[PDB]
Structure formats: structure tokens, C-alpha cells
Amino acid sequence: CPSQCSCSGTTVNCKSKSLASVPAGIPTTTRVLYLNDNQITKLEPGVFDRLVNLQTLWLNNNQLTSLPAGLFDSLTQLTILALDSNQLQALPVGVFGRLVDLQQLYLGSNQLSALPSAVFDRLVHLKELLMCCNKLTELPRGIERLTHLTHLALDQNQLKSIPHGAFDRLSSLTHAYLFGNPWDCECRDIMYLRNWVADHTSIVMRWDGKAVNDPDSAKCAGTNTPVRAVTEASTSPSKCP
Template sequence: MHFLWVLLAISAVLVAVQGQPQPACDSVGDASPVCRCTSTRVNCKNAGLTDVPTGIPSGTRKLDLSGNRITSLPKMVFDGLSRLDTLDLSDNKISSIDAGAFGGLGYSVDTLDLSNNELVTLEKGVFRGLRGLLKIYLSDNNLIELKNNSFGTHRSLSIFNCNNNKLTTIDAGFFSRYPKLAYLYLSRNNLASLPPGVFDNLSKLWSLDLSNNELESLDDAAIFKDLSGAGFIDLRLNKLKRLASGIFSKSNLIKLKFLALQNNSLSVIENGAFDNLPSLQSLDLQYNPLENVDCGIVPTQDMSPSLERFSVSCTCEIKPLYSCPNFAWVGVKTRCEDMWTTIIRISLDCSTAAPMARSAAHASGTTSTNWITLAAQWLFSNLFIRD
């Protein structure tokens, strides 16, 4: 009978505390059954939490709540943590964040990680109080839109990562409030178009990743006009069909080094599209169904003196490049994706119904591909040509 009463008592205690937030730290510096606590750090990673714990010391600067089962963040849940600078909530199951959830944090928070959660929408004003924010990570959620009213000005924000969501819509001017933004990641979303002026006022932006979306066109000819500090633009794995002549050349991209356009549906690139890119080192156009290729689509020595690599799919459509006045210069930099060599060292057999690239050995009468010769050519060429 005594044993039965003990079991009943334990059950009553469990019922009483079920669903209640657990204390993080008994006191500063003490070990805790929930979190590991020091004077400035509280580590609750993989602690099995379903709610944000209580009792987090007010002097905490770094709070790690990653790898738990937290589903929501109620209003003022972090009240009193005015010295916090890093808040990691990644790898939870958060699907809702109340407006004011970060209200007690003050201006000290510079890093907020909400990646790999279950967010679909963001409440109005949810991030407005975080004026000192430098980095925000929202990747691997289910967000469908980025709305101006969910965010504040965040004038010091330098990293915005929203990779691998389900974004279809971004409010016009959304990023223009972040003049110090340096890294913008929007890869692996469902963006079919971009609003006019979406990248205005971003002269500090260095890296822009728009790869693996549904973009079919860049309708705003001035969309990149303010990206004078950009060094890397990634537009791979979209559905772009056409590039207008001024889309890059009239955008003042004086620091652009890497431009990735492979795996699109590009059939038309207007002449001069890649002019006025003085710092360009790598241009990738592989796996595009290019048609009517003209000398005007390739970078020239006077416009892009720093060019080291121009990658294309070596089909018969690019044969006109052999007749270009600057072919001696651009040919040694033009790489075929599957030939391990530069275009200047191969010829194109366009006499068959299914055109294909062939090596220089074929041109001399060899009936089958001499891979040893091709490898030797590649090795020899790379002794003198920088990739």
C-alpha cells in the first residue's frame, strides 16, 4: 500500500509540472539538469525542451536553444535578457512567433538563428525591436513571402539567409532598408519574378544568391543598378530565357568577379550583355540552349581584362565564336564543360544530324576519340593558361 501511495504522489507531481517551462539554471555557474550555464553562456542544445526554459540569468550573452522541440515563442518570452547578443533557435519545430516575442531583448542582439523550423508566415512587427541585428538566419523553413511589416529597419544587418523556403513573393523595397547588407541568400525558393527596386540601396552587397528558383525573366532592366559592390551573383538553375543587352552592362557592376548563369533556358543573349564588367573573372553559361550566338555576347579584353574563365556547352551553336576578332584572347579562356580543355584546342563537327564537339585529333582524321591525346592537350594548355 505504501508503494502505491508513492507512485500516486510521483504521478501527481508529474501532472502538476507537465507543460510548464523548466528552469534553465539554478544559479549562475551551477550545473543544471536542463542547460549548461556559465556567467555569460547558457547552452540548452538537444535538451528535449518543448518551451523556452525559465530562470535564464540576466547577464547571459549567448543562448543556445537549438535541437529541441519548441513549437512557439509567446510574447516577451525573453524578457529581461537585455545583454543577449546571440540567440540560436535553429533545429526546433517553431511554427508561430508572437509579435513582441523578442521585445525584452533590447538592442544588443546581433545574431538570430531560426533556421530549420516550421515557419510559414511571420507576424507583423515580429522583428521590429531588434535594431542591432547583424545576422538573421531563416533558411529551411516554409516561408512563402517576405513582407515589410514583419521587419524593422535593421540598418546594421549584414547577413540575410532565407535559403530553402517556399518564397513566391517579396515586397517591393524589402531589402532597401538594409544599406549594410553584404550577403543575401535566396536560393532554393519558388520565386518566379522579382519586384522593381528589390535590390535598391544595396551598394555594400557582396554576394547575391538567387540560384534554384523559378525566374523566367529579369523584367526590370535596372534591377542590379545599385549593386556596385557586388562580387558574386548566382542565377544558376532558374528558367531565364533571355538576357537584355543592358541587364549587367548598364548596372555599374564594377567589382563583379563571378557571374553564374548555367542551367537556365537561355536561348537569346543580346549583344553587349556582358560589357562593362572590368573585374569579371568567371562567367558560366553552361547547359543553356543558346541560339544565334554572336561575337557580341562574349566578354572582350578591353571590357573584361581580368577574365580567366568563360564556360559554355560546346555545341555547334557556339561555332561563330571561332570567327570573332578577339577569339585568340577569349578562346583560351573558354571552357567546354565536358572536354577538360579550352575551346581553342577543339573543333566542332557540325556535319552530322546530331552535332557534337570533337577534339583536334578528330580534325586530323582520327576515327575515334583519342582520350590520351586530349588529356595531354589539356595538361599542356594548363601549363600556360590560368583557370
């Protein structure tokens, strides 16, 4: 067990230890690794390659700005990966490609403005994708195929519309977060999101420390009227970004 951490069974707790880097001596038998709430700024390539039995990896609340390619490739048993509240500007191609058993992926509160095109293509079991508080300007391609999602958090980005049909196959959704985006209700492309929210009022949520059902929390930019109230006749294809 690493000096600065505490260990019990197969859980290694290095949370809130003022760590500047991943400590040495994490046993290969570790299944749960808390590295959150530290000041880790960089992850060496291969730092996790030994930890083939990892099931939950908490890297949230650090100072990561990038990730090396292949960082998680050995962690095939991973079901929860937390990267929220770092400063990630981008993700490398194929960063999640080997995490076929992943169920929860936390990417919120970073500086991501886009994702690689195939970033989610192998996450055939993902149930929660949490991506609030970034700089996303378009819905990442591949979310349309994450049919087992129950939680999708897109709040507080820079999204102006949702591509037509993007949510139609997400029939297991119970929590959808859309507030805090400058939805462009003059542009004709807004109609899909308008029509989808009107048909899914019970699953659109806002956040006041916890989930609160509010289908009106998706608001039109410039005004304070809900996206779901927009009439098609008030929109035009010529007023799109």
C-alpha cells in the same frame, strides 16, 4: 531572442527550424540573420524594417513565390542577400534599389523568367551575382555595368545568346558559369559569346559539386559541340529566334 531560434552576440540563427513565417522578437541589434531552410511562403511588408543593422540576410531554401515592394529598403548595410532555392516567379521594381553596399546576391534555383529593367542599377559594389537554375531567356539588362563582378552564374537557364559586348566591361570576372543553356549556334548572334569564351577560357566554369574550369561546358543546342568552336560562316542572321 525568438523561442525557436538560437542567438549569440549579434547573430540570430533560425536555420532549419520548420518555420512557417518569420518569428517575432528578432532584436534590432541583429547583424546576421539566418532564416534559411524553412517553409516560409510569404513575407509581410515591413517585416524587416526594424532591422536597420542587418549585414547578411539568408532567406534561401524557403517557399517564397513573390516579394513585397520595399521589403529590403531599410537594410542599407546589407552586404549579402540570399534568396536562392525559393520559388520566386518574379521580383518587384526597385526591390534591391536601397542595398547600395550589397556584395553577394543569390537568386539561383527559383522560377524567374526575367528581371525588372533597373534591378541591379544601384548595386555599385556587387561582386557575386548567382542566378543559375531559373527560366531566363535573355541576359538581364544592367549586368553589363556590374564591373566589380568576380562571380557570374547563368547556368541552367534558357539563354540562346549573349548580347554583343555584354561581358566586355566585367574585367574582374574569375568565375563564369554558362553551361546548361540551349545556345543557338546556328544564329549569327552566337558569335559574341563564341568570341568572348575563346578569349576568356580560364574563367569559364562548370559545376560538379564545385567549380571546375571548362570553357567547352557552353554547348550548342541539339549538338554536343562547344560554343567556342563555332565558325562564323556556319551561322546566319536568318536563323535567329
